[PDB]
Design a protein around this motif. Structure first.
Motif, PDB file in Angstrom:
ATOM      1  N   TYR A 118       0.791  -1.221   0.000  1.00  0.00           N
ATOM      2  CA  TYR A 118       0.000   0.000   0.000  1.00  0.00           C
ATOM      3  C   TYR A 118       0.828   1.278   0.000  1.00  0.00           C
ATOM      4  N   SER A 119       2.155   1.192   0.049  1.00  0.00           N
ATOM      5  CA  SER A 119       2.965   2.392   0.224  1.00  0.00           C
ATOM      6  C   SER A 119       4.413   2.095  -0.139  1.00  0.00           C
ATOM      7  N   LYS A 152       6.634   7.060   4.985  1.00  0.00           N
ATOM      8  CA  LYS A 152       5.796   6.066   4.326  1.00  0.00           C
ATOM      9  C   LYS A 152       4.850   6.828   3.406  1.00  0.00           C
ATOM     10  N   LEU A 185       2.063   7.063   0.865  1.00  0.00           N
ATOM     11  CA  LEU A 185       0.948   6.162   0.626  1.00  0.00           C
ATOM     12  C   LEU A 185       0.584   6.125  -0.851  1.00  0.00           C
ATOM     13  N   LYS A 186       0.313   4.921  -1.349  1.00  0.00           N
ATOM     14  CA  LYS A 186      -0.177   4.754  -2.703  1.00  0.00           C
ATOM     15  C   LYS A 186      -1.639   5.182  -2.777  1.00  0.00           C
ATOM     16  N   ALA A 195       1.816  11.237   3.096  1.00  0.00           N
ATOM     17  CA  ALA A 195       2.909  10.443   3.634  1.00  0.00           C
ATOM     18  C   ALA A 195       2.889  10.534   5.152  1.00  0.00           C
TER      19      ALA A 195
END
Ligand SMILES: O=C(O)[C@@H]1O[C@@H](O)[C@H](OS(=O)(=O)O)[C@@H](O)[C@@H]1O[C@H]1O[C@H](COS(=O)(=O)O)[C@@H](O[C@@H]2O[C@@H](C(=O)O)[C@@H](O[C@H]3O[C@H](COS(=O)(=O)O)[C@@H](O[C@@H]4O[C@@H](C(=O)O)[C@@H](O[C@H]5O[C@H](COS(=O)(=O)O)[C@@H](O[C@@H]6O[C@@H](C(=O)O)[C@@H](O[C@H]7O[C@H](COS(=O)(=O)O)[C@@H](O)[C@H](O)[C@H]7NS(=O)(=O)O)[C@H](O)[C@H]6OS(=O)(=O)O)[C@H](O)[C@H]5NS(=O)(=O)O)[C@H](O)[C@H]4OS(=O)(=O)O)[C@H](O)[C@H]3NS(=O)(=O)O)[C@H](O)[C@H]2OS(=O)(=O)O)[C@H](O)[C@H]1NS(=O)(=O)O
Length: 332
Positions: free
Chosen positions: A49-50, A67, A69-70, A109
């Motif tokens: 997912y990220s 991180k 994020l997608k 993020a």
């Protein structure tokens, strides 16, 4: 006639008695920051997912983890943010330091405290019996804390357990699949990794609770004391239940099905068959015997149950004789 309802044995109404703002994450207001406060140092990995980076906070030279994020539903981003904020400061919980957006991309993020990771693949064979007990106790601290706060992790697996073995620190990470527990709520069974899905997910029983995490923990334990990762290694979601049934037996499985009036997928009766409940000595050999003991087997057996109600709670698990020595060493 429909499945029989289920309620958690512990922490049943924790969210009902807290204010609405605690668990109603869809209305949580996020103050997004500027990702320019962080310079990406290097890429750590690309998850499901990220994407994860080691970065530096140019305002105070702090090492952090970013991180990014997608593209996913903003509802899930709010959920993960709210859960990380509600659990911030808890024992062995990863710490959310900041929440930012790229000034041009507007991509969200999450910033986390840096943890000196040790890969579980190369760390498994390093762990002694006592190390296994100690880190299991730490994971139990994290799980009992988050369960008492009305939250199930739903993605407990070795990948989500950061360990700094040098300082014997442990953090439970990746709360993007975690949810708030509400009695009577039916949840999505398409969660967690296949090898760690509890039977309730595989038979499509949606009214599960914190006990799900405990099943996952059992799987982890089974992979560590037996040196077989993953322990239940199924080809797909049906073969996963088949692999579980070949160990726990089919009798308890069908008793569990009948107890909750679960409508079983008709493609299961073609592959489940009839299997006895295997004694754990079947999986012990000369390479893992030093990690297996009667206490470990009793604890593991009390973790891996079809009936989610009969599994040990995190608190009950913390009191098993398997951890006695650990507790003794923690009183110093
Ligand atoms: O910002 C910031 O940060 C910054 O800060 C700082 O720096 C500063 O400040 S100071 O003060 O300090 O100085 C600054 O700088 C800043 O701030 C500022 O600014 C900014 C900018 O400016 S401007 O110019 O721009 O103005 C701003 O900001 C902005 O904005 C914001 C917001 O808005 O918020 C952001 O944005 C972002 O984010 C957001 C979110 O956030 S939070 O906060 O919240 O976290 C987002 O938004 C989201 O979304 C949207 C859309 O959509 O678009 C909206 O929504 C809406 O609509 C929808 C529609 O629908 S449809 O159908 O059509 O599609 C609705 O609905 C929804 O959705 C749907 C869908 O999806 O489809 C659905 O879903 C699901 O479900 C259902 C169910 O049904 S039944 O049957 O069951 O009954 C189903 O059906 C379906 O199908 C599904 N779907 S699927 O797909 O899945 O299948 C539903 O319907 C729903 O959903 S849910 O989830 O909800 O359930 C909805 O509802 C609506 N909503 S409302 O609200 O409206 O009501 C919205 O808005 C939202 O949503 S929610 O949910 O959340 O509510 C967005 O999007 C974003 N954007 S982007 O681009 O990124 O993408 C940001 O920030 C910005 O923006 S931009 O554009 O620019 O980027 C601010 O404001 C300022 N501040 S002040 O205060 O000053 O003003």
């Amino acid at each position: 006639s429909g499945p029989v309802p289920s309620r958690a044995r512990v922490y049943t109404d924790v969210n009902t008695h807290r204010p609405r703002e605690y668990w109603d994450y869809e209305s949580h207001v996020v103050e997004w920051g500027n990702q320019d406060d962080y310079q990406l140092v290097r890429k750590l990995g690309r998850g499901k997912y990220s994407e994860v980076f080691e970065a530096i906070n140019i305002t105070n030279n702090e090492k952090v983890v970013v991180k990014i994020l997608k593209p996913v539903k903003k509802k899930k981003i709010k959920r993960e943010i709210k859960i990380l904020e509600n659990l911030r400061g808890g024992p062995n919980i990863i710490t959310l330091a900041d929440i930012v957006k790229d000034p041009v991309s507007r991509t969200p993020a999450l910033v986390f405290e840096h943890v000196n990771n040790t890969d579980f693949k190369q760390l498994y064979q390093t762990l002694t019996d006592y190390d296994i007990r100690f880190y299991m106790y730490e994971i139990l601290k994290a799980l009992d804390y988050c369960h008492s706060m009305g939250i199930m992790h739903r993605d407990v697996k070795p990948h989500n357990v950061m360990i700094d073995h040098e300082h014997r620190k442990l953090r439970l990470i990746d709360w993007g699949l975690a949810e708030f527990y509400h009695p009577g709520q039916e949840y999505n069974v398409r969660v967690a990794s296949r090898y760690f899905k509890g039977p309730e997910l595989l038979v499509d029983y949606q009214m599960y609770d914190y006990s799900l995490d405990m099943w996952s923990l059992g799987c982890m334990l089974a992979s560590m004391i037996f040196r077989k990762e993953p322990f239940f290694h199924g080809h797909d979601n049906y073969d996963q239940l088949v692999r579980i049934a070949k160990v726990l037996g089919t009798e308890d499985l069908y008793d569990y099905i009948d107890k909750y009036n679960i409508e079983l997928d008709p493609r299961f009766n073609d592959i489940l068959g009839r299997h006895s409940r295997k004694r754990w000595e079947r999986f012990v050999h000369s390479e893992n015997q030093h990690l297996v003991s009667p206490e470990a087997l009793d604890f593991l057996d009390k973790l891996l149950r079809y009936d989610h109600q009969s599994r040990l709670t995190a608190r009950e698990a913390m009191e098993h004789p398997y951890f006695y020595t650990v507790v003794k060493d923690q009183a110093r």
